[PDB]
Amino acid sequence: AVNGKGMNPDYKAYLMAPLKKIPEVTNWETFENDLRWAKQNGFYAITVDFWWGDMEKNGDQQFDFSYAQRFAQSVKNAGMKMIPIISTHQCGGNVGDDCNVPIPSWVWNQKSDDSLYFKSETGTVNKETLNPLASDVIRKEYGELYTAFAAAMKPYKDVIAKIYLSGGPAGELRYPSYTTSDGTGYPSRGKFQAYTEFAKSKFRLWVLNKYGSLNEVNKAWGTKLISELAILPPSDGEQFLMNGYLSMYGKDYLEWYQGILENHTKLIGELAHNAFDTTFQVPIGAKIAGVHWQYNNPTIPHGAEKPAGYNDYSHLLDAFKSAKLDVTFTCLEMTDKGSYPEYSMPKTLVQNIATLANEKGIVLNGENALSIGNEEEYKRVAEMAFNYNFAGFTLLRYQDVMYNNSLMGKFKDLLGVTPVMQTIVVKNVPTTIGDTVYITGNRAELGSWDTKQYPIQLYYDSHSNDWRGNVVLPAERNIEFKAFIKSKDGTVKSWQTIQQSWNPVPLKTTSHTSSW
Ligand SMILES: [Ca+2]
Numbered sequence: 388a389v390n391g392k393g394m395n396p397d398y399k400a401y402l403m404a405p406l407k408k409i410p411e412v413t414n415w416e417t418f419e420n421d422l423r424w425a426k427q428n429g430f431y432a433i434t435v436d437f438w439w440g441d442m443e444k445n446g447d448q449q450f451d452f453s454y455a456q457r458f459a460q461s462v463k464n465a466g467m468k469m470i471p472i473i474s475t476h477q478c479g480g481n482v483g484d485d486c487n488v489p490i491p492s493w494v495w496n497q498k499s500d501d502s503l504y505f506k507s508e509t510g511t512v513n514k515e516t517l518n519p520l521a522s523d524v525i526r527k528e529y530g531e532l533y534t535a536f537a538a539a540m541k542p543y544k545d546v547i548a549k550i551y552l553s554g555g556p557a558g559e560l561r562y563p564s565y566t567t568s569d570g571t572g573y574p575s576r577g578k579f580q581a582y583t584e585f586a587k588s589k590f591r592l593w594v595l596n597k598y599g600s601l602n603e604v605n606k607a608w609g610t611k612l613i614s615e616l617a618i619l620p621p622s623d624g625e626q627f628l629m630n631g632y633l634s635m636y637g638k639d640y641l642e643w644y645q646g647i648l649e650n651h652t653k654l655i656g657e658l659a660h661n662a663f664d665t666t667f668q669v670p671i672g673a674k675i676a677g678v679h680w681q682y683n684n685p686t687i688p689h690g691a692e693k694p695a696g697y698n699d700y701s702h703l704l705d706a707f708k709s710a711k712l713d714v715t716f717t718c719l720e721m722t723d724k725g726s727y728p729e730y731s732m733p734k735t736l737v738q739n740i741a742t743l744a745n746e747k748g749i750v751l752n753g754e755n756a757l758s759i760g761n762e763e764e765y766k767r768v769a770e771m772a773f774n775y776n777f778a779g780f781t782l783l784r785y786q787d788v789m790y791n792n793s794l795m796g797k798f799k800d801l802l803g804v805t806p807v808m809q810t811i812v813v814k815n816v817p818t819t820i821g822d823t824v825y826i827t828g829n830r831a832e833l834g835s836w837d838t839k840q841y842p843i844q845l846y847y848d849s850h851s852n853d854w855r856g857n858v859v860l861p862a863e864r865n866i867e868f869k870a871f872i873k874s875k876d877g878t879v880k881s882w883q884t885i886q887q888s889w890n891p892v893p894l895k896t897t898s899h900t901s902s903w
Pocket of ligand 1: 443447448527528531532
């Protein structure tokens with residue numbers, strides 16, 4: 388792993404449930420066996436969406452937690468744990484989709500203005516989730532939904548390992564900037580979604596607030612706005628993204644647009660900590676979408692992210708630290724391409740997020756973006772998960788592994804692991820001052836033979852006068868490894884004479900000793 392350490396000792400693996408309800412897919416009794424198998428394979432919990440549209444369907448406070456309570460008792464029958472997602476967003480809705488669970492149809496009548504939905508630059512309306520702009524309606528409806536959920540789930544606190552919140556569409560904290568209706572699906576640029584009348588007044592009132600009056604706006608921006616109504620979102624998203632963004636106006640607009648998700652993040656964070664904490668005491672998390680296309684496009688840089696609401700990841704992550712929410716990032720199975728026309732750079736994004744997450748001390752978790760049908764993708768997931776300190780990895784989705792024992796078996800070897808602290812000792816290392824000693828080995832957990840950025844560092848035990856390290860390894864997997872010296876200058880100076888091995892690493896903590 389990066390910075391001379393090993394894999395996150397808290398690492399745990401999770402499986403995503405199907406989108407349909409279990410009784411639509413199998414029967415409770417077969418589920419219980421499937422969970423038991425999944426557990427055999429290193430999975431610790433089943434993550435599952437409970438739809439807002441199912442739980443509060445007929446009207447305000449007319450709750451129905453019966454599917455959720457049943458699902459937990461089976462989880463509890465199988466000796467597993469579960470991570471519920473309170474899916475306050477719409478499931479599917481375009482055929483080919485496995486579900487169609489829109490949010491509760493009565494929530495819209497709560498307002499007679501257009502503040503609860505989204506509208507794009509070209510007027511496309513989106514209603515897959517509530518606009519984080521309407522925070523009064525959010526704080527009521529999600530505070531109520533959170534708090535009732537906590538009441539229906541109390542009898543099961545013992546199988547609840549964490550709770551997820553839905554920050555926006557598809558359960559991600561973003562704007563619905565990439566849709567087929569809005570002519571903005573991968574890999575095209577994203578459209579801004581601040582075109583309701585309500586989003587425009589909000590942007591105006593936040594500018595007047597920041598600078599007082601139109602006269603100081605115009606000084607700040609170098610513009611000649613004739614009246615307060617001319618303060619508006621960008622009139623051409625393409626020019627704004629080509630160069631509009633550099634202007635003072637463009638910084639102010641992006642700062643408000645992303646700021647609305649920093650605010651949302653803090654609101655649900657506070658509503659979920661209040662509903663859940665005292666009773667469950669589990670970590671609460673939220674997700675950021677992996678918007679990897681149009682990343683390194685030379686003339687509309689980050690053309691898909693910005694409109695999604697991601698302009699400054701360091702700022703977005705500070706809001707998560709402040710709400711005490713753990714983050715979940717996706718795309719860990721992908722590689723950078725970065726060529727016309729999609730300009731996709733997923734691996735580079737994941738690395739940037741991980742690094743900011745770890746520097747900020749935010750716990751991190753990952754997911755694959757598409758279904759994995761082959762082991763080379765699992766290998767890529769492991770490189771990222773074990774070298775960038777991921778605390779957990781969740782696999783989408785259930786049916787891919789459950790009815791394919793070959794893939795299940797590949798998943799278990801490479802990602803279904805149990806981390807165990809081990810002591811590695813190397814005697815008689817011929818170092819001179821300023822040299823450092825590292826190990827590197829064949830699995831992803833060992834940095835895959837990398838000597839440049841993932842090697843694990845050892846340390847000198849004066850007393851025993853040897854180099855040693857407490858390293859976390861995957862229990863019960865065969866490993867090959869070698870120590871090596873790195874001169875004060877960063878260059879590999881020499882290698883251990885014989886390749887070492889541990890077959891397999893043992894389940895109980897102990898030491899592996901070897902000689903230079
Ligand atoms: Ca309600």
